[PDB]
Structure 1
Amino acid sequence: NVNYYSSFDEFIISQYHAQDGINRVSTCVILGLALQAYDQMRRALPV
C-alpha cells in the first residue's frame, strides 16, 4: 500500500499537493537528507 515515483522530485511535489501537505514535506525533507547520507555511505562501503 505505497506509491512509487521515478525521482525524489516527483515524490516531494506529490506529497506537497496532498491534504496536510505542509506537514508532509517536512518529513520528506528529512528523508532526503537520510537518503543523501545513504548514498555516500553505501558507495564507500558497498554490500
Structure 2
Amino acid sequence: NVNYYSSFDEFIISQYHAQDGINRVSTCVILGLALQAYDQMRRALPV
C-alpha cells in the first residue's frame, strides 16, 4: 500500500504537493540523509 518513484527528486516534491506537505518534507529530508549514509556504508561493505 505504498507508491514507488523513479528518483528521490520526484519523491520529495510529490510529498510537498500534498496535505501537510511541510511536515512530510521534514521527514523526507531525514530519510535522504539516512539514504546517503546507507549508500556509503553498503559500497564499503557489500553483502
TM-score range, shorter chain: over 0.9
Deviations 1:4-43 (A, max 9, x none): 0000000000000000000000000000000000000000
Runs of 5+ unmatched residues, structure 1: none
Q: TM-score, with normalisation over the residues of structure 2? A: 0.99
C-alpha RMSD of the superposition: 0.2
- Identity over aligned residues, as a percent? 100
Runs of 5+ unmatched residues, structure 2: none
Aligned mates of 1:17, 1:33 — CA distance in 2:
21
The total of aligned residue pairs comes to 47
